[PDB]
Amino acid sequence: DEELQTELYEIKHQILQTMGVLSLQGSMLSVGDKVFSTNGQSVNFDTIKEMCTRAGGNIAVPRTPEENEAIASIAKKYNNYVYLGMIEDQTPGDFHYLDGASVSYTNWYPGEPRGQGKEKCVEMYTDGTWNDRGCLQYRLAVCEF
Amino acid sequence: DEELQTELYEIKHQILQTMGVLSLQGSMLSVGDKVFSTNGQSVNFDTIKEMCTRAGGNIAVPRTPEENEAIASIAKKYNNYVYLGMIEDQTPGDFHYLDGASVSYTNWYPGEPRGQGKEKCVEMYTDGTWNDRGCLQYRLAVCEF
Amino acid sequence: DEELQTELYEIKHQILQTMGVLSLQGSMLSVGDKVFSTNGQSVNFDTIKEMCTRAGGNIAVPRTPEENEAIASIAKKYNNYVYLGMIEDQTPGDFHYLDGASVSYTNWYPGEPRGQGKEKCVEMYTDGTWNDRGCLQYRLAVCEF
Ligand SMILES: CO[C@H]1O[C@H](CO)[C@@H](O)[C@H](O)[C@@H]1O
Ligand SMILES: CO[C@H]1O[C@H](CO)[C@@H](O)[C@H](O)[C@@H]1O
Ligand SMILES: CO[C@H]1O[C@H](CO)[C@@H](O)[C@H](O)[C@@H]1O
Ligand SMILES: [Ca+2]
Ligand SMILES: [Ca+2]
Ligand SMILES: [Ca+2]
Ligand code: NA
Ligand code: NA
Ligand code: NA
Numbered sequence: 248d249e250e251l252q253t254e255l256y257e258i259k260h261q262i263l264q265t266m267g268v269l270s271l272q273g274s275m276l277s278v279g280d281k282v283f284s285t286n287g288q289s290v291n292f293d294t295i296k297e298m299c300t301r302a303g304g305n306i307a308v309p310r311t312p313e314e315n316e317a318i319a320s321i322a323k324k325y326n327n328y329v330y331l332g333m334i335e336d337q338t339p340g341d342f343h344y345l346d347g348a349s350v351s352y353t354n355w356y357p358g359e360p361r362g363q364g365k366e367k368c369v370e371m372y373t374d375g376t377w378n379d380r381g382c383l384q385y386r387l388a389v390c391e392f
Numbered sequence: 393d394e395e396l397q398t399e400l401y402e403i404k405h406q407i408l409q410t411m412g413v414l415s416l417q418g419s420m421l422s423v424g425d426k427v428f429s430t431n432g433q434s435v436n437f438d439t440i441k442e443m444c445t446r447a448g449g450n451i452a453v454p455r456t457p458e459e460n461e462a463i464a465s466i467a468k469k470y471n472n473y474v475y476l477g478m479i480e481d482q483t484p485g486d487f488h489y490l491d492g493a494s495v496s497y498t499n500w501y502p503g504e505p506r507g508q509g510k511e512k513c514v515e516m517y518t519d520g521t522w523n524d525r526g527c528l529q530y531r532l533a534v535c536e537f
Numbered sequence: 538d539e540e541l542q543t544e545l546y547e548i549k550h551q552i553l554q555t556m557g558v559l560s561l562q563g564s565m566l567s568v569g570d571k572v573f574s575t576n577g578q579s580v581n582f583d584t585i586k587e588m589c590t591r592a593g594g595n596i597a598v599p600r601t602p603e604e605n606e607a608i609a610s611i612a613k614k615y616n617n618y619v620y621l622g623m624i625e626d627q628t629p630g631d632f633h634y635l636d637g638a639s640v641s642y643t644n645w646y647p648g649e650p651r652g653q654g655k656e657k658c659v660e661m662y663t664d665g666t667w668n669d670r671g672c673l674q675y676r677l678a679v680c681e682f
Contacts, residue, residue: 262410
């Protein structure tokens with residue numbers, strides 16, 4: 248109806264306002280329909296995952312060059328590597344998103360991955376390239392919503 | 393209709409994103425349908441009330457164990473007592489929410505309350521238990537929305 | 538319908554919560570339907586404009602006394618002048634909003650403006666009054682959404 252179109256207008260305006268404030272202050276990065284954010288903490292994979300799910304999101308994982316660059320800027324900003332939301336399959340060298348799906352977009356640093364199943368996790372260098380590594384290091388916690 | 397179901401989807405997704413960012417960064421605590429937050433200030437009862445109403449909320453008051461524990465964690469976090477949204481009735485020993493209703497859930501520290509009408513307000517210890525006290529002390533301002 | 542009225546209720550409640558948290562923590566100022574916010578940075582006009590548009594908003598411009606006072610408080614808070622969203626027309630002494638429209642509400646400091654076309658921009662003093670100035674100074678970035 249009409250009164251509905253009005254309601255939805257204010258609602259959408261208010262959401263734009265809150266998101267604008269959050270982005271202006273650098274509390275989050277918006278890329279397409281995905282929002283990235285970090286609590287500034289450096290912890291291991293399992294810890295990061297918990298923090299993200301607890302906030303209603305998931306450990307971040309880039310699926311496009313633009314998403315990858317957004318995460319890289321946060322890593323650069325806090326000057327620390329970032330654990331991405333993906334783990335190695337049974338067959339070494341092969342990685343999958345946590346939902347199980349096979350990884351499509353990748354940005355491995357030349358030569359990577361090369362840990363032969365010893366390094367199940369994936370960390371992002373400050374330049375955005377990836378490196379498979381063990382899941383017990385302390386990495387910047389970056390979540391996506 | 394259909395286009396409406398689509399609109400509402402993005403709107404709900406965007407709200408989840410902003411709330412997720414706010415919770416991930418510890419700017420707020422979500423418990424059920426209630427959101428708690430503090431400006432980090434330590435002021436008296438009347439001041440806190442003003443700050444909260446000015447932000448569009450109310451001075452926090454726990455009505456369930458989970459809500460009580462959420463507030464307690466903030467008190468613990470800032471290491472300071474928290475004034476709760478409730479005041480003593482005419483009959484000492486009896487307290488009511490600011491809307492007038494009688495207090496149901498309580499978590500008095502053993503022996504409390506025992507100020508015999510001299511202490512109209514209620515402060516929360518860092519362990520979550522309550523103590524009736526005067527309303528002129530400087531306590532962490534915690535609001536609920 | 539009914540289920541819709543319910544959906545919209547939670548949505549509106551959640552927006553109030555996020556906006557309340559943001560205002561309680563001083564991350565933004567709400568005046569009517571306008572929200573003001575600053576990233577705390579001091580840069581020139583062109584830079585500010587970019588930062589604001591990038592966050593989904595615009596460089597702030599007061600159109601009412603209340604809006605003017607809100608911006609002034611931010612300037613006072615960060616103790617710095619604020620560039621407003623307006624520039625001088627061809628005819629010196631005349632200013633227009635960036636959308637082109639003619640400026641209606643004004644709050645020039647006594648004697649201002651008086652740069653005779655040499656100062657195309659407008660800066661706000663910490664007391665809220667305006668002064669036309671060059672657009673190359675470093676001013677607090679305040680955006681409106
Ligand atoms: C000890 O090996 C480390 O360095 C190589 C090359 O940098 C990485 O591939 C590996 O995952 C470890 O981070
Ligand atoms: C001086 O009394 C104080 O201590 C007792 C016991 O701790 C409280 O009950 C009371 O409200 C005051 O805080
Ligand atoms: C050098 O002139 C400066 O001071 C006058 C008066 O304060 C302003 O009008 C002008 O824009 C400049 O800021
Ligand atoms: Ca490796
Ligand atoms: Ca007492
Ligand atoms: Ca001037
Ligand atoms: Na490996
Ligand atoms: Na009492
Ligand atoms: Na001028």
